[PDB]
Amino acid sequence: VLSEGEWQLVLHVWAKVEADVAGHGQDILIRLFKSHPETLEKFDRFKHLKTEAEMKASEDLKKHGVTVLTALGAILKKKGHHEAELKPLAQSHATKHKIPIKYLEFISEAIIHVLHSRHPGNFGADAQGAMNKALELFRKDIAAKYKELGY
Ligand code: HEM
Ligand SMILES: O=Nc1ccccc1
Secondary structure (H helix, E strand, O other): OOOOHHHHHHHHHHHHHHHHHHHHHHHHHHHHHHOHHHHHOOOOOOOOOOOOOHHHHOHHHHHHHHHHHHHHHHOOOOOOOHHHHHHHHHHHHHHOOOOHHHHHHHHHHHHHHHHHHHHHHHOHHOOOOOOOHHHHHHHHHHHHHHHOOOO
């Protein structure tokens, strides 16, 4: 469980991400897709994108970045009490999208790498630590739904 102080650091930096949900989304997906090309293959929607320039120019990618960061923000603002928000995500991602839990680790690294670029002053190592912890709690809870479902 995160402390109240840890939550405040998390949600402080997230309030900032939300100045530009779309721009954050782009940076995060593109970092994921370049660092972990296997991830891009899970998306029939996006696997025609063969360069970073093409990814950056994709309005549909941008659109989907917002869908993702919107869901994550909702989850983070529950400060651990995210059961309702997490059940549908775990279901669709295990059984329909076929996403390994390992890939949640990779997007966690991407989120941290980007939150870093765009809000250094509000993402010192204390806030980085808190954000790590929050993303780890999320992954743990997803992992247990996965195990339930046989994935
Ligand atoms: C922070 C982690 C994540 C969040 C919050 C998230 C959120 C979402 C949401 C809200 C949707 C649409 C609704 C649904 O189908 O359930 C979605 C769809 C999807 N997600 Fe994720 N996701 C996450 C991680 C990942 C990762 C790491 C991958 C792949 C490596 C992935 C692959 C997909 C795919 C393939 C779809 C279907 C998209 C389409 O073609 O339209 N997700 N995600
Ligand atoms: O659509 N869900 C995604 C979440 C994170 C990265 C890429 C896609």
